[PDB]
Amino acid sequence: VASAYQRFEPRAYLRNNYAPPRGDLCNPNGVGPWKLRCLAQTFATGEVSGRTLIDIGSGPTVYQLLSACSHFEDITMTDFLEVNRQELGRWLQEEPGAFNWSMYSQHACLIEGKGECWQDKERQLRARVKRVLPIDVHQPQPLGAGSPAPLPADALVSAFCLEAVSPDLASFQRALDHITTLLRPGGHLLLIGALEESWYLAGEARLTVVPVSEEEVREALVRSGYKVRDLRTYIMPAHLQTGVDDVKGVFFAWAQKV
């Protein structure tokens, strides 16, 4: 896969998945509103807290941390590709060419209902993201030997990574076992991913993906030593079925390392 990922174009990836129609946040039935709503509700339970958090395979996106950032003062973002870490850098440092996530920040504020202005939410994320490190979930030690990242983390977040870098279920299970080592016992894992997908595009790159089911993800979490606190499925409607992939749904898993 690492080979195919050498052609991965962040801008194309962003455009394919986070720009209209999939990125439209006005229609309450879209995947965008559904996902932000499920990230906000999880953190609103007050049960997912601590000091440090690590986002596994962040790619060029930050939406997965909008609701999470107000609960963890030290946040580590990561990704296998340097081009993605650079794309993140552009938004974090507010440099030219950064992707504009303002509609997402605003919706997270809208959903959270704490009366927070979106600039303050983005300010807080930028402030708490202490570093952006390389990572490889295929390695028993994903971050490596002496990573600047505070370990073990009190919580992990990973969206669309594992199944997208695993050729099969068994390999999926190992990557999960792998990243699980980065988590403090009793800690929390918020895993988001593509259901029954076999490929997706990112510019000249065409990636192979392992198609997994909700049941398969649940059992994998259980086998890695987690207690599944919540599991949800969003079925991808026809209007969101574009030619960028063959994903059937999106899953969300809130797991607790026991």
Ligand X SMILES: O=S(=O)(Nc1ccc(Cl)cc1)c1ccc2c(c1)CN[C@@H](CO)C2
Minimum CB distance to ligand SAH, residue 77 (Å):
10
| Residue type, position 146, single letter | G
Q: Contact region for ligand X (CB under 6 A) — 76-84, 112-120, 181-189, 243-251?
A: 243-251
**Is residue 256 within the footprint of ligand SAH (CB under 6 A)?**
no
**Is residue 250 within the footprint of ligand SAH (CB under 6 A)?**
no
Q: Any known ligand binding at 159? A: yes
Picking from 205, 124, 123, the residue whose alpha carbon sits closest to that of residue 164 is 205
Burial class (CB in 10 A: 0-12, 13-18, 19+), 139: exposed
Burial class (CB in 10 A: 0-12, 13-18, 19+), 208: middle
Query: Which uninterrupted H or E stretch holds 157?
Result: strand 153-159
**Is residue 34 within the footprint of ligand SAH (CB under 6 A)?**
no
**Is residue 16 within the footprint of ligand SAH (CB under 6 A)?**
no
Minimum CB distance to ligand X, residue 194 (Å):
4
**Is residue 180 within the footprint of ligand SAH (CB under 6 A)?**
no
Q: In this chain, which of 245, 253, 255, 257 binds ligand X, going by CB under 6 A?
A: 245
Q: Contact region for ligand X (CB under 6 A) — 29-37, 45-53, 109-117, 221-229?
A: 29-37
Minimum CB distance to ligand X, residue 142 (Å):
19
Half-sphere exposure of 193 (CA within 13 A, CB side): 33
Distance from C-alpha of 77 to C-alpha of 62, rounded to nearest angstrom? 9
Distance from C-alpha of 253 to C-alpha of 225, rounded to nearest angstrom? 14
Q: Any known ligand binding at 197? A: yes
Q: Contact region for ligand SAH (CB under 6 A) — 68-76, 160-168, 229-237, 242-250?
A: 160-168
Distance from C-alpha of 70 to C-alpha of 67, rounded to nearest angstrom? 7
Structure tokens at 108: 């997270």
Tell me 245's DSSP state: B
Distance from C-alpha of 121 to C-alpha of 102, rounded to nearest angstrom? 10
Q: Contact region for ligand SAH (CB under 6 A) — 68-76, 110-118, 146-154, 155-163?
A: 155-163
**Is residue 67 within the footprint of ligand SAH (CB under 6 A)?**
no
* Element counts in the chain: helices (H) and strands (E): 8, 9
Site of interaction with ligand X (CB under 6 A): 17-18, 22-23, 31-32, 35-36, 63, 160, 164, 194, 197, 200, 209, 240, 245, 247, 250
Residues contributing to the annotated binding site: 13, 18, 57-58, 63, 79, 84, 136-137, 159, 197, 245
Residues contributing to the annotated binding site for octopamine: 197, 245
